[PDB]
Design an enzyme around this catalytic site. Sequence first.
Site, short mmCIF file in Angstrom:
data_model
loop_
_atom_site.label_atom_id
_atom_site.label_comp_id
_atom_site.label_asym_id
_atom_site.label_seq_id
_atom_site.Cartn_x
_atom_site.Cartn_y
_atom_site.Cartn_z
N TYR A 1 0.35 25.16 9.62
CA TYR A 1 -0.89 24.34 8.32
C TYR A 1 -0.72 23.89 8.25
O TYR A 1 -2.69 22.73 7.79
CB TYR A 1 -1.91 26.10 7.62
CG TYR A 1 -2.38 27.00 8.93
CD1 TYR A 1 -3.12 26.88 9.21
CD2 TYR A 1 -1.78 27.98 9.34
CE1 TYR A 1 -5.01 27.75 10.29
CE2 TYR A 1 -2.57 28.98 9.66
CZ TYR A 1 -3.28 29.21 10.10
OH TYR A 1 -3.97 30.18 10.89
N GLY B 1 -0.51 19.51 7.62
CA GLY B 1 -0.96 18.83 8.67
C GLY B 1 -2.08 18.43 8.76
O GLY B 1 -3.34 19.81 8.09
N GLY C 1 -5.11 19.22 11.12
CA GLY C 1 -4.87 21.39 11.95
C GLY C 1 -4.34 22.00 11.68
O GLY C 1 -3.88 22.76 10.56
N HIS D 1 -7.22 25.92 2.00
CA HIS D 1 -7.37 24.94 1.79
C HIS D 1 -8.14 24.25 3.00
O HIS D 1 -9.46 24.04 3.62
CB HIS D 1 -6.06 24.49 1.99
CG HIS D 1 -6.73 22.48 1.40
ND1 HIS D 1 -6.08 21.16 1.95
CD2 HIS D 1 -7.51 21.64 0.73
CE1 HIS D 1 -6.28 20.15 1.86
NE2 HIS D 1 -7.68 20.22 0.62
N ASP D 2 -7.44 24.43 4.71
CA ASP D 2 -8.09 24.16 5.65
C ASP D 2 -9.75 24.86 5.72
O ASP D 2 -10.77 24.60 6.12
CB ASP D 2 -7.37 24.53 6.96
CG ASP D 2 -6.37 23.80 7.14
OD1 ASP D 2 -5.64 22.68 6.38
OD2 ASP D 2 -5.56 23.79 8.06
N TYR E 1 -12.30 23.38 2.93
CA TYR E 1 -12.66 21.95 4.32
C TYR E 1 -14.19 22.33 4.79
O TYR E 1 -14.57 21.82 5.13
CB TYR E 1 -11.22 20.71 4.97
CG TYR E 1 -10.44 20.16 3.65
CD1 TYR E 1 -10.81 20.43 2.19
CD2 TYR E 1 -9.92 18.62 3.86
CE1 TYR E 1 -10.14 19.32 1.26
CE2 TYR E 1 -9.55 17.88 3.41
CZ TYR E 1 -9.60 18.38 2.21
OH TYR E 1 -8.81 17.50 1.34
N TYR F 1 -14.12 11.52 -5.93
CA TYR F 1 -14.53 12.05 -7.11
C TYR F 1 -13.73 12.85 -7.43
O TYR F 1 -13.38 11.64 -7.39
CB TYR F 1 -14.29 14.26 -6.83
CG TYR F 1 -13.06 14.51 -5.60
CD1 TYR F 1 -11.59 14.44 -6.50
CD2 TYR F 1 -12.57 15.04 -4.04
CE1 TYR F 1 -10.26 14.47 -6.36
CE2 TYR F 1 -11.33 14.98 -4.08
CZ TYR F 1 -10.53 15.13 -4.51
OH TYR F 1 -8.97 15.20 -4.22
N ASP G 1 -9.04 20.84 -2.88
CA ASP G 1 -8.48 19.90 -3.44
C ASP G 1 -7.29 20.72 -4.26
O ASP G 1 -6.00 20.90 -4.71
CB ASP G 1 -8.37 18.24 -3.67
CG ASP G 1 -8.83 17.14 -2.39
OD1 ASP G 1 -8.34 18.29 -1.17
OD2 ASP G 1 -8.77 16.84 -2.38
C1 LIG Z 1 -2.53 10.17 2.35
C2 LIG Z 1 -3.10 9.81 3.78
C3 LIG Z 1 -1.55 10.73 4.30
C4 LIG Z 1 -2.30 11.26 5.66
C5 LIG Z 1 -1.71 13.15 5.45
C6 LIG Z 1 -2.29 14.23 6.80
C7 LIG Z 1 -2.50 15.28 6.76
C8 LIG Z 1 -4.02 16.19 6.53
O1 LIG Z 1 -4.52 16.51 5.19
C9 LIG Z 1 -5.20 17.45 5.16
C10 LIG Z 1 -5.36 18.78 5.44
C11 LIG Z 1 -6.26 19.26 5.82
O2 LIG Z 1 -7.29 19.25 6.73
P1 LIG Z 1 -6.85 19.79 8.69
O3 LIG Z 1 -5.69 20.15 8.60
O4 LIG Z 1 -7.94 18.95 9.35
O5 LIG Z 1 -8.52 20.80 8.00
C12 LIG Z 1 -9.82 20.53 7.88
C13 LIG Z 1 -10.20 21.65 9.55
N1 LIG Z 1 -11.77 21.68 8.58
O6 LIG Z 1 -4.83 19.39 4.31
P2 LIG Z 1 -3.36 20.24 4.12
O7 LIG Z 1 -3.56 21.34 3.96
O8 LIG Z 1 -2.88 21.00 5.23
C14 LIG Z 1 -1.65 19.27 3.80
C15 LIG Z 1 -1.66 18.33 3.85
C16 LIG Z 1 -0.82 17.46 2.58
C17 LIG Z 1 -0.97 15.34 3.08
C18 LIG Z 1 -1.58 15.35 2.22
C19 LIG Z 1 -2.69 14.55 1.90
C20 LIG Z 1 -2.90 13.44 0.79
CA LIG Z 2 -4.61 21.90 7.95
CA LIG Z 3 1.88 21.97 10.16
#
Ligand SMILES: CCCCCCCCOC[C@H](COP(=O)(O)OCCN)OP(=O)(O)CCCCCCC
Ligand SMILES: [Ca+2]
Ligand SMILES: [Ca+2]
Lengths: 118, 118
Positions: free
Chosen positions: B27, B29, B31, B47-48, B51, B67, B93
Site C-alpha cells: 500500500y 506508494g 495505489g 491513508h489511501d 484520500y 494546506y 497526512d
Molecule cells: C514528492 C513526491 C513523491 C512521490 C511519491 C509517490 C507516492 C504516492 O503517495 C501518495 C499515497 C496515497 O495515494 P494513493 O496510493 O494514490 O491513494 C489514493 C487512492 N484513492 O500515500 P501512501 O500512503 O500510499 C505512501 C507515500 C509515501 C511517499 C510520500 C510522498 C511525499
Molecule cells: Ca498507497
Molecule cells: Ca507498495
Amino acid sequence: NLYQFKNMIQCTVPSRSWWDFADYGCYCGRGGSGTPVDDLDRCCQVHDNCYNEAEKISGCWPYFKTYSYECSQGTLTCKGGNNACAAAVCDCDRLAAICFAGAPYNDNDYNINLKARC
Amino acid sequence: NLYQFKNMIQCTVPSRSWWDFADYGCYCGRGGSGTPVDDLDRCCQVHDNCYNEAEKISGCWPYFKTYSYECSQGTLTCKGGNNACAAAVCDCDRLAAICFAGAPYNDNDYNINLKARC
Ligand SMILES: CCCCCCCCOC[C@H](COP(=O)(O)OCCN)OP(=O)(O)CCCCCCC
Ligand SMILES: [Ca+2]
Ligand SMILES: [Ca+2]
Ligand SMILES: CCCCCCCCOC[C@H](COP(=O)(O)OCCN)OP(=O)(O)CCCCCCC
Ligand SMILES: [Ca+2]
Ligand SMILES: [Ca+2]
C-alpha cells in the site's frame, strides 16, 4: 518423524536453531492458514500441504513415521528401507529443509499475531 | 500536497528518508491492494482510504491541495486558512505521518513483488 525433520533442518541451515522456525509467519509451526507472509512462510505452507497428501495414504502419520535419509554437507536424499508412508513424508521433509535454506529469515515475522496477519 | 506530506514525515521520522516509504508493502506508494503486509503497510492502507474520502469533496485532489500546518518538536497540527478540502487532506497526512513514526520498518518489505505478494 519430527525429530528427523529438525535434523534435516540442521543439515541445510547450520547456524539458525531449529526452534527459530517453530513459530514463524502464518504457516511455520503446528497448522497454518491464510496468506504466507514471505518465502520462508511459503516453504512451510507447501510442507504442510505435502503432509496433508501423505496422510491420505492411510495409516500414515507424518509426525511419527520414521524414515531413512542422509545428510552430505548441505544436501539430503531419502534412502532404502522406506515404505510408501516413510518415502512420502521423507520427501516432504527433504524439500522443506531445502526450501528453508534458500529463503531469507525475517525476525519481524517470528511469533506474529496470527489473528491480525493471517 | 505531497511536498508538504514529505515534510510532515520529516517532522515525525527525521532519521529515515521519505524515499523509504514510497515503495513499501502492498500500500505505501501510488495505489495499493491485497492484505497489508505489516503495521506500516496498514498506515498506508488507512491513508489511501482517507484520500479516497477527501476526493468526495468536490474539486478536492489530495495529491495537489496545499494546506496549513505546523511541526513542533515531533508533533503535527493543521492550522487556520484551510478550506474543506485542505483541512480533510491535512488531517489525512497528519495521521499518516504520526502512524509511520509508531510502526517498525521491516527492510524485507521494501520494493516487494506486488504480483507475488499482494
Ligand atoms: C514528492 C513526491 C513523491 C512521490 C511519491 C509517490 C507516492 C504516492 O503517495 C501518495 C499515497 C496515497 O495515494 P494513493 O496510493 O494514490 O491513494 C489514493 C487512492 N484513492 O500515500 P501512501 O500512503 O500510499 C505512501 C507515500 C509515501 C511517499 C510520500 C510522498 C511525499
Ligand atoms: Ca498507497
Ligand atoms: Ca507498495
Ligand atoms: C509447541 C510447538 C510444537 C513444536 C513443533 C511442531 C511442528 C512440527 O511440524 C509442523 C509442520 C508440519 O505439520 P502441520 O503444520 O501440523 O502440518 C499440516 C498438516 N496437517 O511443519 P512446518 O512446515 O510447519 C515447520 C515447523 C518447524 C519445526 C522443526 C522441528 C520439529
Ligand atoms: Ca506460524
Ligand atoms: Ca505448519
